[model samples]
Target: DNLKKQLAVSVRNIQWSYGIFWSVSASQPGVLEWGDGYYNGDIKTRIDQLGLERSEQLRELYESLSLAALSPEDLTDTEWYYLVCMSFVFNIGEGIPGGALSNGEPIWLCNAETADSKVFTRSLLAKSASLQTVVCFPFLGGVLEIGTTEHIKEDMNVIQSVKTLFLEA
Candidate 1:
């Protein structure tokens, strides 16, 4: 509980508003297991304010993707879509997450739509949610990714902070 609290604080400090830790499975190789998550109250409010058109789009995407969030309670369709997509597994060098892990490096994408990776699955939903920035930290046999609605310049301080906080855990 205390660790989770610390992680929540770290997320806020990084200005991400939300954070989740995914644990990679040794036996399953590329499989990623859901660990824990933290969300700022404002994120729920933001998700709740989704317009009808966006909500319908999210629902359609969810159905077509066959995705489900780890915790669906009290989440809007758009929120569930982002959460479910975040939990999706990635093979080495497959997507942003996998590419980070493959190179044993952290990746920060300020303009996800412009990212060259073909496997970036959340580009549409991310733009709809106004989450344009994302950071992926790969370490300790897993990866931690955080998203922000605002465009943010990639700062070394932010990367170092996340590495020290989520990577060591």
Candidate 2:
């Protein structure tokens, strides 16, 4: 049952990712509005226009999955955590993670992952805001949301490991 649920979530996430990739990026019609003539501009160009450094976001995700120098896959769970975490940040802005407090000061633990990667994941899932935003975002809609937080409601049993998604036959 768990595996099936997870597979559903993964498939949904993959579909969502592909959906956005094609619809937003490849499709000639870019977020068209009835009255406006292709006002969104090029999909890739829009991401560039966001000016939030989406390319940089994708690069970091690739490096993490590829086992780059800054962080390596110490555990399977950690690898998965990084994948979803990166996706979360990439789909939504880094704002969901609460980048800066009201004082504009960095929260030391914002990016400091704990030794147990599960802890990192739990922290993410526990945050209603983060969970809500990630699932509601167009690209990650089908997957990545668990519980009655927002977007979609499910359970931890729904999460699929990133490694399983990209690797393993």
Instruction: Please report the candidate that would top TM-score against the real structure.
Output: 1
C-alpha lDDT values of all predictions: 0.62, 0.27
Q: Write the per-residue lDDT of candidate 2 for residues 1-169, one digit (tens) a residue.
A: 1233332334344432210110122232222111100011112222333222332343364565757222333223323332344343222122312222112221222322221333233454335223221221122212222112234333223234332552231
* lDDT for each residue of candidate 1 in 45-92, tens digit (9 for 90 to 100): 225331223333433544555642223344554366455663477777
Model 1 lDDT, full chain set: 0.62
Task: Give the worst 10-residue stretch by lDDT in candidate 2.
Answer: 32-41
Model 1 / residue 110 / CA error / Å = 1.0
lDDT of 2 at 48: 38
Best by lDDT: 1
Question: For model 1, what is the alpha-carbon lDDT of residue 10?
Answer: 68
Model 2 spans with C-alpha error above 4 angstroms: 1-75, 90-96, 110-169
Tell me each candidate's TM-score. 0.69, 0.21
**Angstrom error at residue 129, model 1:** 1.3
Query: Given candidate 2, what's the lDDT at residue 7?
Result: 27
How does candidate 1 fare on TM-score?
0.69
